[PDB]
Amino acid sequence: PSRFVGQYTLTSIHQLSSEERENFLDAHDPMRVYDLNSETSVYRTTQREYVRNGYATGNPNSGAIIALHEELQESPYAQHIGARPDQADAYRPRTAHVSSLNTPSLNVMAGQGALSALHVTTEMRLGDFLDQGGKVYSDTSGGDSVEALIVTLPKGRKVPVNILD
Numbered sequence: 318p319s320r321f322v323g324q325y326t327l328t329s330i331h332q333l334s335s336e337e338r339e340n341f342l343d344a345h346d347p348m349r350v351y352d353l354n355s356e357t358s359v360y361r362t363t364q365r366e367y368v369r370n371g372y373a374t375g376n377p378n379s380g381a382i383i384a385l386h387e388e389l390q391e392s393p394y395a396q397h398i399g400a401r402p403d404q405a406d407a408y409r410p411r412t413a414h415v416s417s418l419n420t421p422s423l424n425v426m427a428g429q430g431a432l433s434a435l436h437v438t439t440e441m442r443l444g445d446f447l448d449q450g451g452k453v454y455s456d457t458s459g460g461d462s463v464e465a466l467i468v469t470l471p472k473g474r475k476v477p478v479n480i481l482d
Contacts (some may be wrong), residue, residue, distance in 0.1 A: 327408065331387075384457050420471060423470070427463070442477070
């Protein structure tokens with residue numbers, strides 16, 4: 318199970334075959350893993366002032382740590398199992414500071430237990446981020462049926478929000 322030690326040298330999903338790349342995305346891309354889409358609603362708490370005109374803008378200075386599902390790092394279990402160095406199961410996404418994206422973003426919660434898990438509570442349409450070039454990352458910085466996400470929102474862009482409380 319540990320024969321491949323030192324051989325887990327891949328660092329990008331593009332270094333994997335098409336089949337393994339798809340396997341990795343199936344296991345780590347938030348969009349696929351949590352079965353998200355343009356109509357998925359995402360939530361976060363904030364202050365009225367920031368969304369008083371019905372829109373929210375991305376935060377330029379977040380301290381969030383995100384998972385990069387397109388980049389690889391040896392899985393802590395690769396050596397425990399016999400994971401081949403050219404297979405998706407031998408790796409896990411790399412993580413990085415959100416500032417590395419050089420783009421404002423918003424930390425949101427998604428899932429049936431989101432609203433519960435969570436100043437005012439806002440709701441947003443994931444598609445509104447996506448339609449404007451926003452990207453979704455798992456936030457690695459609740460319980461079950463809820464996932465923490467980081468969604469980018471390019472400079473000068475905004476998304477409509479609904480205050481729930």
